[PDB]
Amino acid sequence: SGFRKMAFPSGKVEGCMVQVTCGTTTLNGLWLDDVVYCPRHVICTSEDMLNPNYEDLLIRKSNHNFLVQAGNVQLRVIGHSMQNCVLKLKVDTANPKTPKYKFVRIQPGQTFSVLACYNGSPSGVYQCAMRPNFTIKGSFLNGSCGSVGFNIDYDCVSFCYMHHMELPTGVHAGTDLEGNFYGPFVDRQTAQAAGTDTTITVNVLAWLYAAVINGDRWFLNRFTTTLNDFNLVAMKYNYEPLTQDHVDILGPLSAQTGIAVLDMCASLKELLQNGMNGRTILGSALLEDEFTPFDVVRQCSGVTF
Amino acid sequence: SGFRKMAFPSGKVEGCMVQVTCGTTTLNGLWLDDVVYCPRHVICTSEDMLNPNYEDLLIRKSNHNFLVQAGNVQLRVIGHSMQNCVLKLKVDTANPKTPKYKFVRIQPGQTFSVLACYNGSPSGVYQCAMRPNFTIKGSFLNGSCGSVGFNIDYDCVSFCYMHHMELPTGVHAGTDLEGNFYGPFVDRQTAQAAGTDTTITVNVLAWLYAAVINGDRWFLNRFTTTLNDFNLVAMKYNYEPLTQDHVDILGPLSAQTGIAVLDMCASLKELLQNGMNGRTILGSALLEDEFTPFDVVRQCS
Numbered sequence: 206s207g208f209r210k211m212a213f214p215s216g217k218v219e220g221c222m223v224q225v226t227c228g229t230t231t232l233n234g235l236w237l238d239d240v241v242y243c244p245r246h247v248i249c250t251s252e253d254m255l256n257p258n259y260e261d262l263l264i265r266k267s268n269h270n271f272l273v274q275a276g277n278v279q280l281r282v283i284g285h286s287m288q289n290c291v292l293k294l295k296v297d298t299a300n301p302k303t304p305k306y307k308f309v310r311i312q313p314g315q316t317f318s319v320l321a322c323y324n325g326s327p328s329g330v331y332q333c334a335m336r337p338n339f340t341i342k343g344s345f346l347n348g349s350c351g352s353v354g355f356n357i358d359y360d361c362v363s364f365c366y367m368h369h370m371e372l373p374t375g376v377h378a379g380t381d382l383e384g385n386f387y388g389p390f391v392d393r394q395t396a397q398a399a400g401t402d403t404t405i406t407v408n409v410l411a412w413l414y415a416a417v418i419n420g421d422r423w424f425l426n427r428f429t430t431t432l433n434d435f436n437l438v439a440m441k442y443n444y445e446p447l448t449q450d451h452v453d454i455l456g457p458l459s460a461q462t463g464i465a466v467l468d469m470c471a472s473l474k475e476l477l478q479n480g481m482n483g484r485t486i487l488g489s490a491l492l493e494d495e496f497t498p499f500d501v502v503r504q505c506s507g508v509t510f
Numbered sequence: 511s512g513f514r515k516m517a518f519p520s521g522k523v524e525g526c527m528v529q530v531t532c533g534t535t536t537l538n539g540l541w542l543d544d545v546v547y548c549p550r551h552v553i554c555t556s557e558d559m560l561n562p563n564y565e566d567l568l569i570r571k572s573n574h575n576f577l578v579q580a581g582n583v584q585l586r587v588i589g590h591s592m593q594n595c596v597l598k599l600k601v602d603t604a605n606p607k608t609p610k611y612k613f614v615r616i617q618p619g620q621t622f623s624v625l626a627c628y629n630g631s632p633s634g635v636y637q638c639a640m641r642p643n644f645t646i647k648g649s650f651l652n653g654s655c656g657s658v659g660f661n662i663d664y665d666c667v668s669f670c671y672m673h674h675m676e677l678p679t680g681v682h683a684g685t686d687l688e689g690n691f692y693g694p695f696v697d698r699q700t701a702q703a704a705g706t707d708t709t710i711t712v713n714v715l716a717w718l719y720a721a722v723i724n725g726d727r728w729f730l731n732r733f734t735t736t737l738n739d740f741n742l743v744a745m746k747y748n749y750e751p752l753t754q755d756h757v758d759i760l761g762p763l764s765a766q767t768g769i770a771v772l773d774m775c776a777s778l779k780e781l782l783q784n785g786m787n788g789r790t791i792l793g794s795a796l797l798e799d800e801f802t803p804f805d806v807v808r809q810c811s
């Protein structure tokens with residue numbers, strides 16, 4: 206029993222974190238087989254970052270301009286290239302701790318675990334969701350750049366995120382492991398802002414199902430609604446539209462608790478219009494939106510890695 | 511920027527998790543050097559839940575009655591003994607993945623990471639605190655027993671909790687790694703009730719200092735308070751008493767933000783009176799009490 210914001214065990218990813226230094230910039234790289242992946246902005250100085258030409262800045266660099274440290278050993282860089290916004294440094298040694306892995310791109314609303322590191326040294330792990338505005342509500346201090354986000358399914362690590370930058374509102378922007386930004390962001394020291402965020406409706410409903418499974422039932426009512434009725438309410442409170450795919454994904458939770466998704470929507474409608482009237486749900490006074498349906502089912506059935 | 515409940519990286523603990531079976535009971539054990547630590551109730555049948563006589567059940571066991579599984583490998587048990595409520599199984603292989611570690615007994619209000627495990631396989635990692643009533647608000651299904659709580663400071667793993675049982679209120683009780691329970695609990699299925707849960711006042715203050723460091727000042731006020739007047743108000747909201755120790759411990763965060771401990775106590779007093787008025791502090795609509803002064807200095811520097 207109980208319900209906690211739960212990260213994947215980080216051990217398979219800890220074995221891949223290295224320090225990458227180019228001149229006076231140090232940040233984190235991901236070492237898989239014989240390639241280290243890290244943000245391309247590692248080749249920039251303060252001045253360069255104002256308006257960088259990357260293909261230009263990179264052409265000037267020799268392999269020995271990249272110091273890669275794995276724990277307290279040196280890796281020899283034998284090659285370098287860019288893919289979008291990530292620098293791929295080829296090294297002479299395959300990482301013997303390389304796990305089974307894939308690079309995947311996640312959709313907004315999907316969650317993942319972030320291993321925060323500093324100087325190639327993992328310091329913490331937390332669970333994040335990709336916001337609808339493509340930012341993450343992370344916790345990063347200077348030297349966190351190149352920290353990665355991952356999911357585990359069976360023994361296979363799915364890397365989905367690499368940290369590139371903080372936005373002026375305290376939130377974080379990065380790329381998939383192929384160097385494609387999540388959101389309308391660029392790796393340049395310029396004026397960029399998080400767009401208006403919205404609430405991930407399917408995740409709130411998942412968390413309401415988590416609450417019911419843990420015996421927190423006060424918000425249930427006799428009422429049901431329709432998608433269209435509900436979506437007009439959602440739009441009004443800055444909630445993402447709920448689609449038929451969403452209802453289908455919540456299906457198992459609807460069957461395990463006897464509460465139909467449009468039944469639970471009628472509960473969420475009422476929490477949106479009236480508030481929580483002094484009560485909490487799973488010890489929270491806000492509606493939690495960073496648990497997916499899969500996350501609720503996984504934690505309430507004890508799947509291991 | 512940002513502020514998140516962060517757990518420690520779990521890798522050093524994952525390399526220590528095994529499966530212990532005795533009869534038809536399977537739970538988790540912690541493999542360090544050539545010893546596997548697990549809850550002694552692994553040797554209980556359903557006949558033994560209310561009034562187990564552990565010394566009598568244990569003396570009836572051989573080494574070969576204990577199946578220990580590390581991944582796919584079976585480990586050979588060459589010795590067994592009981593220390594308080596933990597069973598210590600000696601095995602013939604030292605765990606090659608043994609980290610630098612120590613056992614520590616923690617005080618209420620202290621935080622640690624839990625590696626939740628089933629059948630010796632890690633499922634997830636989360637951060638929690640020892641509540642004043644010596645329980646933890648964890649996430650634990652059947653088979654999670656022997657999952658451990660830990661802190662990692664530099665490269666050294668401090669093991670501070672092993673999970674033994676769920677209380678009727680859905681909260682969790684367990685031991686240090688010397689097998690002494692936290693709180694008044696016992697490894698018996700008789701009625702035991704969690705003492706009243708209180709809010710960890712020193713932690714809420716630390717988190718209010720965190721909100722100032724990250725640039726939020728809306729809840730400060732012009733008042734101060736005496737220690738004793740603070741405690742007289744706070745206990746009416748089920749808050750733990752703040753001691754001179756807690757006031758000393760908040761010293762660095764005071765110095766860093768230029769807000770005296772007793773001025774921050776005055777703010778908390780007003781927060782308890784007013785609630786938030788639709789505002790949030792570090793993304794929360796309640797007062798967070800599961801970050802310690804030490805965690806705030808760690809995550810905000």
Ligand SMILES: *CC(=O)Nc1sc(-c2ccccc2)cc1C(=O)NC1CC1
Pocket residue numbers: 534535536537551552553554555556651652653654655656674675
């Ligand atoms: C942690 C917990 O609830 N303890 C467990 S796990 C367990 C079991 C039984 C069969 C298959 C897999 C796991 C048994 C218990 C338990 O509470 N009772 C044990 C007999 C003493």
